Amino acid sequence: SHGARKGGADTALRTADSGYLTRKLVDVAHEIVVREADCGTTNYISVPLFQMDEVT
Amino acid sequence: PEWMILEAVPVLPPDLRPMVQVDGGRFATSDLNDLYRRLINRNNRLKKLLAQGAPEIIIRNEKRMLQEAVDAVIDNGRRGSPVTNPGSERPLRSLTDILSGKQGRFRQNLLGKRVDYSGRSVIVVGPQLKLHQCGLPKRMALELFKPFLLKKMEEKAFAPNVKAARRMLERQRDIKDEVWDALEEVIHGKVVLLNRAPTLHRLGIQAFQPVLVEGQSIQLHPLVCEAFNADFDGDQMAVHVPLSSFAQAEARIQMLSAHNLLSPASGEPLAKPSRDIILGLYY
Amino acid sequence: KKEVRKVRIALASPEKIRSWSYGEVEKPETINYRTLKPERDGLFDERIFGPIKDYECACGKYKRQRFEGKVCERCGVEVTRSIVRRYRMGHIELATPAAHIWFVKDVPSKIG
Amino acid sequence: EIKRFGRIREVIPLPPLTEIQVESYKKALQADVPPEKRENVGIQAAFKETFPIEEGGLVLDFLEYRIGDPPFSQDECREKDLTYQAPLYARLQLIHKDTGLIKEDEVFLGHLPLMTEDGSFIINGADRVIVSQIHRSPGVYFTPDPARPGRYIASIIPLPKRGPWIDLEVEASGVVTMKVNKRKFPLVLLLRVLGYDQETLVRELSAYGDLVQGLLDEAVLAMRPEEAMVRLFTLLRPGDPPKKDKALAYLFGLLADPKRYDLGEAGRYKAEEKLGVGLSGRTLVRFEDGEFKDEVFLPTLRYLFALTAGVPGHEVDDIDHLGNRRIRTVGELMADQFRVGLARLARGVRERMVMGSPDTLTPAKLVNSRPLEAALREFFSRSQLSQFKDETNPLSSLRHKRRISALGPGGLTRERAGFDVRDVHRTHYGRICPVETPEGANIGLITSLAAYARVDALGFIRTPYRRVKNGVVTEEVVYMTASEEDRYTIAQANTPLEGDRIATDRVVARRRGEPVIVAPEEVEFMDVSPKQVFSLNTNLIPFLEHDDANRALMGSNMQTQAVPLIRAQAPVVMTGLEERVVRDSLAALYAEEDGEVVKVDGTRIAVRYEDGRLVEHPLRRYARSNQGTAFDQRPRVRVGQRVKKGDLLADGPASEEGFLALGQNVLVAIMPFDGYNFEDAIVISEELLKRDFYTSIHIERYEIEARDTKLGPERITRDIPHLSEAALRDLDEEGIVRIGAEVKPGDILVGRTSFKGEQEPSPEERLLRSIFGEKARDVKDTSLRVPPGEGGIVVGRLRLRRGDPGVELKPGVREVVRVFVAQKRKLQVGDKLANRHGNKGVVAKILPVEDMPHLPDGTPVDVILNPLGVPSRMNLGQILETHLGLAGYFLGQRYISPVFDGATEPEIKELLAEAFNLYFGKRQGEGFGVDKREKEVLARAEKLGLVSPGKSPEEQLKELFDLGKVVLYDGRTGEPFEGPIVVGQMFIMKLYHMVEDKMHARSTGPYSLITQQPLGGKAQFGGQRFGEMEVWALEAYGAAHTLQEMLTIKSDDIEGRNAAYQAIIKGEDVPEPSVPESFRVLVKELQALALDVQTLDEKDNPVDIFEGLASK
Amino acid sequence: AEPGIDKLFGMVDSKYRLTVVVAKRAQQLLRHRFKNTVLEPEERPKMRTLEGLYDDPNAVTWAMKELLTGRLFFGENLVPEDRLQKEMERLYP
Amino acid sequence: TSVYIEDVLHEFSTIPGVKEDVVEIILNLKELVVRFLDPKMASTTLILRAEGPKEVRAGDFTPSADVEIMNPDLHIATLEEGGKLYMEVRVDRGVGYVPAERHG
Amino acid sequence: KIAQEPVSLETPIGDEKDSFYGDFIPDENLPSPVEAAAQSLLSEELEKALSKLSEREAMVLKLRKGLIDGREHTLEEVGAYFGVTRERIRQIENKALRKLKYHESRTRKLRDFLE
Amino acid sequence: GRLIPAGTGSDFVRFTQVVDQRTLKAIEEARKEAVEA
DNA sequence: CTTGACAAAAGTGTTAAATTGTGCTATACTGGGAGCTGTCACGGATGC
DNA sequence: GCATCCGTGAGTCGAGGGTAATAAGCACAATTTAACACTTTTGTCAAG
RNA sequence: UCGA
Ligand SMILES: [Mg+2]
Ligand SMILES: [Zn+2]
């Protein structure tokens, strides 16, 4: 019960911080909507399929 | 910039800061009224002893009091100990107090609102339901659809006009079979939104076809119960009805639980075999 | 009669507040303890903010929607829908001009 | 019959549970205690401290207080809505100092609410209760420096509001500073007025070596107390010129004044023994001879420097430690408000003395009601610790009274709640239940008093522990506080008791909360019973060791949500504590002496006792409560028979025979059924509704007031101008609903007639009045009609009109009528259900008795729960409850399995073995044999290895039976299930929440006055609120007109909801809205701040959103 | 689900365009009360009721089944909104 | 089907000299089996008068034509000294299970 | 009764610090959406049932009850512009009233609105 | 409380038109009615 | 529909009865008062 | 730049239960409002 | 202060 009930309290607080992050994410990215079919940019980025395992 | 130092102080209309007596012979009023009251009081007294040619000390002090009163009307508690009604701890809520805050006019009375044509209740499993179907309690559904049912009772004989059918439904709940069928005559083809709080994923609200059924409980399909995060320990879910054909179109098309299958988050399926189903199909 | 796509927020001059104001509320009273009617200069006064009853004038000389908008000769109220008491604002003229506390105590104080 | 398991026998019974309410309230009462011998603490403490009053001069002195008899009985106070209280007549004396005029006249103070037998106050007619509080005890404390990695920091703290927190933290430049109420100053300028000069400071300061110079300053070590008294006064309070008498009359109060500084008895005492010193009063310093002394700062600096010198015995003590934390009991809080109120009155005397006629004024003119009576009235009503009693069942209140909260005034708030208060300290143990607590944001904030846990007058909690001398159990039981316990080494109640001596050489024991294997020698103590480690409800859960802490918490918390059932039955397998429960709850009627029953009479149970005098006990049968749950006492005694003292006569709502009964024992089958039990859902046999199982009874209060309006008065009558005859039916004469009538929603309980405020009917309305000629009379119908979603018969009617005896009605109000409406609620579809093991669910589609997964005997199962919830929840207590119940159904005997003492797998399997041996016996004996379907199941059961192959189907079905599994036939088909299904008797509870209440909906109705939005909730009959995140969801779907409608048409829009309603009524499509309302309200609100907010179009030109209203 | 929803989603780029189409068309069907429909007798969506089987009063469904045939036409700024309502409310009462 | 007592306004209100309350007796009222000897009889009424210190039962009712009780040992309610009771019921024949709330 | 003072709408509620007072107060001083269509339906159905009366008497009724200029017209005035005597106007509106009373008992459309 | 910039209220899809064959050809014929006017 | 005679409804003027606003009290009174703690993270203005 | 102080937040819908508290006092002018005597319309009746 |  020592650590268990503690974990209960943990989830309890983090569930409160969840909305804290959520509502702000909404309040920032809200204006984002698909507008143009194509923005018409040459700009891009890559996506490495390989991740380095450190110390290995 | 000199407008920041204000001469004429704007006063909010009576219905915005109401004072009205409730049942029992009581009286109720806004704090903004008391704030304004003390303000104008100090102001008039000020003018009085000012034009009178009173000593500079008292005049100046009165000016200060006028400043802090104006502040009490604008933003209360922004400087020094907030003004409270005599005997009570609770500070008087001013303009700024009303605007800003968790319960402020934006976060409370603007960015979300209480709406007509809606209700809620406890949820129960849907094993007979197919997807877009949902059990909607008879009682709840009738009073929910009352404006529509009135029209369908208008067309379908039984009472001559709207008011007739209205009074017929209100007093004396006979609920003759005629109205049970007429209700379905205005129901079928239209779907109502079902919501489960908290609303996190957009899937927290899904369009479901109302099915008139006994009991006061709301039946929900077991598959989408995963998306809603809901279970039945006695969880409760909301129901709203889209009015205009436009809103109904949006509902039935893109808000439909059947038309939303994959998870908008991961792109992978959202409502899939869960719990029991998996167990049997495994066995 | 026109689409509204734009909303501006700016400072309001004292003259603007004067323009909004239908009168200066002086008497720091609400309603008489008996009549429960808005006091003469009181914060609820009908003679400025408008009638409590729709189209029914304060004193009661004008009543219906027939005569509309015309201020009466007794109480001085206007005959119009009772809804106006929601949208009609007054003003209080200060002897010594005071400051809006927002600009004073704002983090980057604007006056300062 | 009955049966009980377990070895360990409690050597002490559980002391009365209600005591911590009543007894601790008694010490602050001293009602039957003579005015002479009164303890001086509690009520007298708040008295003696507020006296005398001195300010040609006068001194008012205290004598005593009279305890008044209650003006009304506990019953009457409810019906009248009067607080249950009693006049307190205070005795004092007015003494002229110089005049030598001694005038002694006893006076009156006010009314002080008393406590009932169960420990519940009655405020405003509706009985409420005061929960206990928890905060760290006063005195001095020593913690490691939060900032400094080096030495530590001490602290000094009094009772709440009873003095400033005095902190001293050595700053590291090497120097020292002291912080009290946000400020800084060395200790060097403190002790000047404490009797320690330059030399007196540096004497034994060198015992700690390097710490001397910490306190030295040559600037202030020159000057003497009167010179340096004003010095610190220019610092802490520079709100007035630094006068020499101004530091004399100010700083004196913060310490030497016993009033504005009161350090708790517990604080004074504990800090006295922990500092290795002593203290006279409750103050920090003494004021004598114009200078001051020091009993406090010297020892606390002594100990701080000690601990920082690393000397053994002087060390940091834990903050959340239960030895460092005390409890605020009801009486303590009572005195706590009493004293401040009496202080407000104490200054009510001051200004009363300085005016009028100083020559002759009796103390009658010097004493007032208000500064006390209002202070008491403010407490019981509005204090966070004082709230509605839980009447949902006897155990509900019984537990409610034993709860401990760190919240409320004097406590903490959710904003500041950390993992420290939420956690269970190592020393909690048998003092505080580690599990029971809300699952909300209140986790660990509201706990419950553990079973054997007791709180002394000092606030420290202690648990019973039997001492042991050289592996020999001593029958002497000791109550040891947290630190006391921390000293010794306590063994376990489950230790190998060999008959008063220790058996094995490995004994489970701990120190401070640190489990260790200890020899039979070193053990000085052992706990009485493991039950002490858990609270009531938690202790009411059998096989608790097999359930996870979460689900156990949930179950024990749910036992409070329990509702009384008409046929309610005691649990088959219970911990055996249910006996004392219904007793200490005082909900049942027992025998006071050894009597004989003269008559049953389910109103009056009359018994003549051995003393020869007949004492009859009346019954409360079918009466209301706070939760609507009916309070019913069913007489269990025959027309005559002998009754020993303590033996039960009547019953209680949750009581069967004197055992606590929440729900009923039913037959559960663990197996998925047609996806209906999906996700912890519940199916139920229809046969329940026929047997009236899980059927409850609930009543509700409905009150109505007729006042005198400005337009004119009101009255309660049967006469209404437009009413139809058929509705007036059940109203007899005066216009009230008669007893046992039928009231459907919409029907009128009580008629009210009020003169309407008028004006005139509209022209169309007026012409309509002309057609029928019907005149609308002045007075119209205000009648109270029973709200929708509820209704039923009427068990009672309460009529109170002003001018009647014994009843004073509120000013300007003529009549008040209160009807009791009772309903019999039978278990419905979607109703909450649970067991003691923390398994929840609602009712999903009650299935006909026809089709049920029955057994060979043809007896259908009552529930059929879903196994899926079991492994996740990790509660096996329901599995074992079912296993024991399976044997209990046959053997016909209940079982008692205490927490952490009781039945084991072999024993239970034996019970099932016997039960099967009888069952199969009835089978073969009735002229039957093994069913072919049974063979069909036994085959595959044998193939999967569930039963040993080669054995006859007798032995196979036997090996299957004791496993808990049996053969089940599907009622729908009649062919069995492909595998065995564990079934049996499980005790299942019907929870508070029901669909009949929680259901609601709205089309059109009430709107807020401020903004035109509706009013959320069933009460106001409003619509649901659309949350910000619901809005977000709608935005995510990209439904424009849905969200638009939500924000306008159906919510605050003026003509939106109207024109919409008309469009739907006329069969059209609702037009598009214009003005949100509350947006416009927002605009004008902004304008009140002198913010000019204009709505332009596309070209930056102003558009009127107010539609030509305020344009001027 | 709504029969032909995959096809309907396939009929236009954005699903929102489809929604707008169905909405406006259902509106039109409500204005003239089904007498403007492009559907033949066997094509008329029918709701079965104990009293009798009649044409489904729901306009949205009617719009769905309508566009399913593709006998309708849609696009941005197709025709002037002016004459759009003048010859619309004319042809049908 | 249904019952009536002169001292009873509902399923709650207590009868003098009776241990069992109304609905507590009603609990045992539906547990009574009454056979109709007449195939054409859709309705009947049973009469009971029990006073003094006697324990009533099924066999204590007023016997009538075309009706008999298979369990006279079914306990109705205990009555103390002086307790007097007048009861009348009405019995109908039907199929399945119909709740009290469903039938008028 | 006069002694007591009004109660603030900002009054908190119970244990919940968030719950206010004034949000519990309904607005009855503004027409409910049902009342709009109610008064509409009345003013309509009445006008429909009015057309069955003589061109004079039908006008006289709404002139008497103020459905025209919003004000009552005394018999003297209703007769002044019609040239008829006050007594005539009286008998006219009585007769017309009962002639309405015939149709109303039949249709039962306006037999509602009985409050 | 206005139409949300996104969704079906997007300025992209909110200008969509809907016409049935007969009416479409009616207004289509109405074009040549103005060439003689 | 009309003419005259009349009760009741509604008007209009003067007055009795309340309700409401204003003023003054001269022995000498000459700087208030209540305090409340067991957050927490961060971001900016301000001070060393 | 580097410690400190002030300012702003902090989850979603519900369920309920709700409301305490006045120590200046009297004399008189100023209106306001209830009282009341009698007038002019307004509504209703009878007979034409 | 409880329900999810
Ligand atoms: Mg849940
Ligand atoms: Zn006027």
Numbering used by the authors:
A (entry chain D): 1074 to 1129
B (entry chain D): 509 to 791
C (entry chain D): 2 to 113
D (entry chain C): 2 to 56, 62 to 1118
E (entry chain E): 2 to 94
F (entry chain A): 54 to 157
G (entry chain F): 324 to 438
H (entry chain D): 1469 to 1505
What sentences appear in the manuscript?
Here, we determine crystal structures of Taq EσA bound to an us-fork promoter fragment, as well as a complete RPo, refined using diffraction data extending to 4.00 and 4.14 Å-resolution, respectively, allowing visualization of key features that stabilize the upstream edge of the transcription bubble. The results also reveal functionally relevant holoenzyme interactions with duplex DNA just upstream of the −10 element and potential protein/DNA interactions that direct the DNA template strand (t-strand) into the RNAP active site.
We crystallized the resulting complex (437 kD, which we call RPo hereafter), collected and analyzed diffraction data, and refined the structure using reflections to a minimum Bragg spacing of 4.14 Å. In RPo, good electron density for all of the nucleic acids included in the scaffold was observed. The extensive protein/DNA interface in RPo buries 6300 Å2 of molecular surface. In RPo, the A−11(t) base is not stacked on Y217 but instead is about 12 Å away, flipped up alongside the σ3A−3.0 α-helix, sitting between R288 and R291. At the point of melting, a ∼90° turn of the t-strand backbone (between −12 and −11) may be effected by electrostatic interactions between conserved basic residues of σ2A (R220) and σ3A (R288, R291) and four t-strand backbone phosphates in a row (−13, −12, −11, −10) encompassing the turn. Indeed, the upstream edge of the post-translocated 4-nt transcript fits snugly between the RNAP active site and the distal tip of the σ3.2-loop, which contacts the upstream RNA:DNA bp at −3, and the t-strand bases at −4 and −5.
